[PDB]
Structure formats: structure tokens, C-alpha cells
């Protein structure tokens, strides 16, 4: 019937006081719940955050919401949700959230007979993700989002993963640009506060930082004016002009890239592994044209010549074995 | 002639519960869906989205707003639409949507005697479609908008593409600045999650990337350049300063123009058609200046004979590179 | 044992891609599934730590090793590939194509 579905939730809501939580003298009440992300959109290390889009359930009991007669689920319109108790649960980590609202505001409420409620959520939310990039772009991060409830304690409400480790899912469907999900985790802990104990859940990520559009951009650019700066080596001592040219056009170079490549990330004071293999490379330039001008120097200010000729083939053997032994120190280092 | 209507409309409302879907225990209801497009706006890589704006219509039926006695078909104000049943209807590729809200919600409800509504909207939203970037720029892409109901399962509520092939309309008239929609194409179809089966909905656009803009100010600066760094073979190998400095400059410009033409697209780890077409000509202006090294260390040490040689190899290499690459990308 | 899957096409658009098994009496069930990246893999729970799957772009195919084998296990077994927005990995509904049944016993 149609009229008897009515009636019987007009009876449910009446006498329903929204204010008291359900078994308000009582144990407290137990909350399970499940996430499934639909994707997690940005990752900004400007700004230290993450967008995450997800599907919130949550899963209590309520006895004064217990029907009898109707054999099958109520799936009420979501506006009930207006006149029903819900547990205040929030991101602590959030910086920007909301709940998205296209057509209708993204809500469910399932009554069951035996009292059970279920409801679901559509949140967005740019959550808050400290980072160290001392070993950036060769870094394995640690993301978190971190859900707690507001006005009541451990003693009033519980909370559990609904469903133990497989209560998160839709990780598959997370396809970052570089970032990849090497494997996610779920903890579940009481924090204590000034006021008092509250429950407190997470959901971990363990994101590596792909490599290669690094090294492609970044990284063989500055190879390659390191061995602009060694093509010095094999010029005759006497153009002094095309040395000079050649050296200080290569230290130019690096101050370039450098400075156009610094901005991109946030102001970090520590150095991080990439500025370190930069100040690398610009040190060797730097010491190319250094040792140019000490064999003119030698040179201008028979026998002389060939001290030239000696060092210009010491720092031809030289310099390719140190920055080869270099590029090698620092690539296991960080691997 | 006029309380008539205030009259009926107040007995159609009264003693209706907007909670309870249409036919609570009958069959599921079936919404029928319509599109119309206003316009794709931009569409950007870095984002990994585009915009676009909707006139969104569906049409069901409801027998509890059924009336008679008023042969004209309401359209009511868009206010009664808090009073009246409506669908749960969501997007699953939206980030962040909006109904316009210009002097009025955007919003309307049209009864009929029959009892058929027509629910319409006025929509925003920025639709997450991944692009594959690989054949960046000579890339195809698959943009689709996915309709949901967020609650109802396929066992209460139905979907159906309104007029078949014809349910969306307006694409044709869109002129996007790159892209060009080559065929559009409508799904229906059942998506079966965890709680239960659902209905599904799909609109998937192919945009096609026109050439005639990256090709012209992207590639050929590159092109010119590595001619450029070529030049420098006729010069005299005595002329040290004069090869030195055009080497040198050259792959200055080279790194200048990587390094500015970054603002064109976002961090993605593999690489791209236009990254393999920006380190071939690195590495070509670069070689030049290593035989050229080749040819002082050699002379130092016949060597006119080095320089003869490269003029013929450099050019044919570089040919052979660049039909290798657009048989390769195209 | 091991199972290799191939793949061709338009695969951008079908990132996951998982691996079935039916024995003649029992119904179509899900032993796993890995991403289009392949950091990310799904197991049922009959199958933890005894199944692996692995994914190789040379020519975009996906493996499945088979280690303490059971006489349960002697069944049909299928490689599908799912849409972007298709919902559940659990569900054979949502996989669009399906691989040849390949025998093992």
C-alpha cells in the first residue's frame, strides 16, 4: 500500500527528538564506516594539500526508528536527513570541503526494520598534507586523511571499519599523474583533548614519485652543459676567445635553467636532492672555466706550452672520471 | 477561471509525500532524460577537465499530480519544485557543478493532465575526463559526462535516452578554439556496485586535437634552430670564435625554448611526442658542436675532410629523424 | 603454473583488467584484478598470498602465477577489462570483454 508507508513514517518521525542521540543514558552507540574514492584529483606541493572526492557511509543502529508490517527497506528521500540524528563526524586534516550538490544535494538514508540506518555522503575535500621534500623528486610520501567525531566522546560513540581492511576500496580507480598508490592502510585510535577521549579513524596512502619526466626534463639538460663545459678541454690553449666563450655561455646556462627551474616548488629551506646534483653541475662548470683561466694565466704571464698541453690532458682524464664517480655517489645514495 | 486553478493546484499538493518515490511498490519509475548543450568551454590538460553548460530536462510520471478539468498544461513556478518528488539524479565525472541562479533558481516544472512532469535545470559542471598524452599533440580523446541516481537502485528507478539518438542536441553548433568533436555517442546501460544494480547513463564526446597552431609556433622554432646550428659547418674551421659562439648560442636558445615552452601542459611521467621532437633537435645542435670539437682536436693533433662529410650526413640524419618521427605520430 | 594475458586496442580506456575462474558446477567468481599502472592489485580472500598478478607494458599484457596449487583449483579461467566508471571490481556484470576460457587442471 502506499498510504501505509506514509503513515508509518509519519508515526516514526513523531516523537523523534533530533537533539538526544539514539540510547542517550545508555552504552554508546557504534558508527561502522566506508570510503570509496572516486579519484584523488590534485596534488599540490605549492599549496601542501590533496583533493580526495569520495563516497562517506556511515552505518549506526537507532531503535526509535524501528518499523514493523513493511518486510523490505525504506530508501527514503534524502531530505529526511533534515529531521533525523546523524553523528557529527569531520576531516580534521580538511582545508576546503564540501558536499557536492548537482541536481539534488548528494544524499542517502536506508531505514531497515530492525532499526539500522545507513548514510551515505559525496564528499570533496582538500586535505591537509605535510611533506618533506629532502629527497624530492626521489621520495616515498605518506598522505593522510583523518576522521573524528566532534561533539562526543569515546564514551557516547564508537567507531570501526565497517567490513575490517576491505571497508576502504575504489583504490584502483586512483590514477594520479605521477604519483603512484604503492599501498594504503587503516588505523583506528582514541585521541584525548583537553574536553576528553574521542574516536578517531584514518586512512593512510604511501605515494611514490615517478622518475622519469624528472630526469627527462631536469636532470640530462644539466649533463649535457657539464659536457658543453668539457668540450673546452679539447680547443687549442691559444683561442683564448672561444674557450672563454664557451665557459662562461655554459655558466650562463646553469644560471638559466636554475633559476628558472627553482620557482616551481614551494620556498624549502633545506636542500633538496635535485638542488644539490644543480649546485653539482655548476660547481663543475665553475671549476672548467677556473682551470681554463689558471692555464692561461701559467701560459701568457717550448717548456711552457707543454705544461700546458700537460695540464689540458690531466683535466681531460680528470674531469670525466670525477663526474662520473660523482653522478654515481649521488644516484645510490638516493636509491 | 483563475481560483480554479489556485484551487486544483492546492488539492494536487496537499496530502502528497514528497519522501515516497512515485509508485512505492509498484514497478520502478521510468525518467526519461534530455540533453541539450550550450557549449563545451575550455578544456585544459593541466586541470585534466573541461567545462560545460547544459540545459538538463527529464521527464517521468507521477498519477498523484494527475488533474483535469484545465486543458492548458501547467508550467508552474520553479519554487513548487520543493514541494514535488524529483529525482536523485547526480554526475559521477563532476567536480564541481552549479545550477545558475540569475534572478531566479534556473529551474522548471511543467505538469501535465496526463500526470507527466517535466523537471528542467540549467547546469554547470567541470567534468573530469583523463586524456591520454602520449600522441600529444596528434591525440584523439574519449570525454564522456556519466548520469547516476545516487540512491534509488535499477529495481525502483529506470533511465532512458528521451527521443533515442536524438536525446542530445547542440553539438553541432559548438566551436571549440583546438579541439574538434568528430562523433558523439549515448550509453544506457547497468552498473551493478555493492549495495545494488544502478542505473547508468553516458554521453561520451571523440575531440580531436586540430593542427595548425603547435605545429606552426612550437616545432618550427626548433627546426630553424637546428638549420641554424648547421650553418655552422660552411664557416672555415679557422675561425674558431665564429663556430664556437653560433654552437654555443644554438643550444642556448635550445635550452631557452625548453625551458619556456613548459607553461604548455602538466607533469606527466611518460615521455611525449613533442618531448621526442624537442630532445632529437637537442641532441642534433648538440653534435655539431661536438664534431666541430672533433675537428680542432683532430687539426691540433684531414679535418676539411670531417666537415665535408657532416654537411651531407647532418641534413640526411635529420631527415631521416623527421620521417621516422611523423610516420611514427601519424 | 603460469597464465599470460595480452591485450590490444584502445587499453588507455580499460585500465583495470581482471582475472576469473569457473569451475563446471560452480558460478563465475573474482580471483583478482590489477590497474592500468599495476601498483595497484586486488585478491579474493581464497586466493591471498598464493596468487600473484603482474603487469607488463612491452605489449600490454598481464600475468597470473599460480604457487601452492590445490585440486580445487582445476577449473576455467577468464581475463577480462573494465571500464573507467564501471563500479565494483567484484562483479563479472561490470567487465565489458572477456578473454578465451583457458583449462587448467
Known amino acids: 500500500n502506499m498510504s501505509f508507508v506514509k503513515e508509518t513514517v509519519d508515526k516514526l518521525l513523531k516523537g523523534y527528538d533530533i537533539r538526544l542521540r539514539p540510547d542517550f543514558g545508555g552504552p554508546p552507540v557504534c558508527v561502522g564506516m566506508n570510503i570509496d574514492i572516486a579519484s584523488i584529483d590534485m596534488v599540490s606541493e605549492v599549496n601542501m594539500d590533496y583533493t580526495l572526492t569520495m563516497y562517506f557511509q556511515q552505518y549506526w543502529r537507532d531503535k526509535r526508528l524501528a518499523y514493523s508490517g513493511i518486510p523490505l527497506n525504506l530508501t527514503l528521500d534524502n531530505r529526511v536527513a533534515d529531521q533525523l540524528w546523524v553523528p557529527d563526524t569531520y576531516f580534521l586534516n580538511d582545508k576546503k570541503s564540501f558536499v557536492h550538490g548537482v541536481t539534488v544535494k548528494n544524499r542517502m538514508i536506508r531505514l531497515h526494520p530492525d532499526g539500522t540506518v545507513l548514510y551515505g555522503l559525496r564528499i570533496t575535500t582538500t586535505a591537509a598534507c605535510m611533506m618533506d621534500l629532502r629527497r624530492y623528486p626521489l621520495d616515498e610520501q605518506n598522505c593522510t586523511l583523518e576522521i573524528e567525531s566532534y561533539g562526543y566522546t569515546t564514551d557516547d560513540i564508537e567507531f570501526y571499519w565497517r567490513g575490517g581492511d576491505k571497508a576502504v576500496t575504489g583504490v584502483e580507480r586512483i590514477e594520479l599523474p605521477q604519483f603512484s598508490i604503492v599501498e594504503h592502510r587503516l588505523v583506528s585510535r582514541n585521541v584525548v583533548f583537553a574536553t576528553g577521549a574521542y574516536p578517531r579513524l584514518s586512512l593512510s596512502f604511501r605515494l611514490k614519485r615517478n622518475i622519469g619526466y624528472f630526469i627527462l626534463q631536469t636532470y640530462m639538460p644539466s649533463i649535457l652543459i657539464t659536457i658543453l663545459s668539457w668540450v673546452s678541454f679539447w680547443i687549442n690553449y691559444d683561442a683564448s676567445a672561444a674557450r672563454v666563450a664557451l665557459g662562461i655561455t655554459t655558466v650562463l646556462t646553469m644560471t638559466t635553467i636554475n633559476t628558472h627551474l627553482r620557482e616551481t616548488l614551494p620556498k624549502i629551506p633545506y636542500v633538496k636532492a635535485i638542488d644539490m646534483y644543480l649546485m653539482g653541475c655548476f660547481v663543475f662548470v665553475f671549476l672548467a672555466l677556473l682551470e681554463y683561466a689558471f692555464v692561461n694565466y701559467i701560459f701568457f704571464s717550448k717548456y711552457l706550452t707543454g705544461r700546458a698541453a700537460a695540464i689540458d690532458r690531466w683535466s681531460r682524464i680528470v674531469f670525466p672520471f670525477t663526474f662520473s664517480l660523482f653522478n654515481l655517489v649521488y644516484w645510490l645514495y638516493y636509491v | 477561471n483563475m481560483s480554479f486553478v489556485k484551487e486544483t493546484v492546492d488539492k494536487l499538493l496537499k496530502g502528497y509525500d514528497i519522501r515516497l518515490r512515485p509508485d512505492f511498490g509498484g514497478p520502478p519509475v521510468c525518467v526519461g532524460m534530455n540533453i541539450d548543450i550550450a557549449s563545451i568551454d575550455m578544456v585544459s590538460e593541466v586541470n585534466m577537465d573541461y567545462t560545460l553548460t547544459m540545459y538538463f530536462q527529464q521527464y517521468w510520471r507521477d498519477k498523484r499530480l494527475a488533474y483535469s478539468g484545465i486543458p492548458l498544461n501547467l508550467t508552474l513556478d520553479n519554487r513548487v519544485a520543493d514541494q514535488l518528488w524529483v529525482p536523485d539524479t547526480y554526475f559521477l565525472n563532476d567536480k564541481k557543478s552549479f545550477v545558475h541562479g540569475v534572478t531566479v533558481k534556473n529551474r522548471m516544472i511543467r505538469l501535465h493532465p496526463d500526470g507527466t512532469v517535466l523537471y528542467g535545470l540549467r547546469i554547470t559542471t567541470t567534468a573530469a575526463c583523463m586524456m591520454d598524452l602520449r600522441r600529444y599533440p596528434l591525440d584523439e580523446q574519449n570525454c564522456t559526462l556519466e548520469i547516476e541516481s545516487y540512491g534509488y537502485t535499477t529495481d525502483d528507478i529506470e533511465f532512458y535516452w528521451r527521443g533515442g539518438d536524438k536525446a542530445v542536441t547542440g553539438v553541432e553548433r559548438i566551436e571549440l578554439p583546438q579541439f574538434s568533436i568528430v562523433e558523439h555517442r549515448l550509453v544506457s546501460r547497468n552498473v551493478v556496485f555493492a549495495t545494488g544494480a544502478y542505473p547508468r547513463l553516458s554521453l561520451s564526446f571523440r575531440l580531436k586535437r586540430n593542427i595548425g597552431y603547435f605545429i606552426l609556433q612550437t616545432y618550427m622554432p626548433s627546426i630553424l634552430i637546428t638549420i641554424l646550428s648547421w650553418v655552422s659547418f660552411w664557416i672555415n674551421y679557422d675561425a674558431s670564435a665564429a663556430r664556437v659562439a653560433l654552437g654555443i648560442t644554438t643550444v642556448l636558445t635550445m635550452t631557452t625554448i625548453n625551458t619556456h615552452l613548459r607553461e604548455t601542459l602538466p607533469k606527466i611521467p611518460y615521455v611525449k611526442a613533442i618531448d621526442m621532437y624537442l630532445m632529437g633537435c637537442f641532441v642534433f645542435v648538440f653534435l655539431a658542436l661536438l664534431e666541430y670539437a672533433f675537428v680542432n682536436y683532430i687539426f691540433f693533433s684531414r679535418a676539411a675532410a670531417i666537415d665535408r662529410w657532416s654537411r651531407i650526413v647532418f641534413p640526411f640524419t635529420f631527415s631521416l629523424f623527421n620521417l621516422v618521427y611523423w610516420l611514427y605520430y601519424v | 603454473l603460469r597464465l599470460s594475458c595480452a591485450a590490444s586496442?584502445?587499453?588507455?580506456?580499460?585500465?583495470?583488467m581482471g582475472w576469473f575462474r569457473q569451475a563446471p558446477g560452480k558460478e563465475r567468481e573474482f580471483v583478482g584484478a590489477?590497474?592500468?599502472?599495476?601498483?595497484?592489485?586486488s585478491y579474493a580472500d581464497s586466493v591471498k598470498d598464493r596468487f600473484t598478478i603482474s603487469r607488463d607494458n612491452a605489449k600490454n599484457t598481464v600475468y597470473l602465477e599460480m604457487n601452492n596449487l590445490k585440486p580445487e583449483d582445476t577449473a576455467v579461467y577468464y581475463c577480462?577489462?573494465?571500464?573507467?566508471?564501471?563500479?565494483?571490481?567484484?562483479?563479472?556484470?561490470?567487465?565489458?570483454?572477456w578473454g578465451q576460457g583457458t583449462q587448467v587442471t
Open positions: 577480462a577489462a573494465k571500464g573507467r566508471y564501471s563500479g565494483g571490481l567484484y562483479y563479472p556484470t561490470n567487465y565489458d570483454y
Open positions: 586496442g584502445h587499453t588507455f580506456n580499460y585500465p583495470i
Open positions: 590489477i590497474s592500468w599502472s599495476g601498483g595497484s592489485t
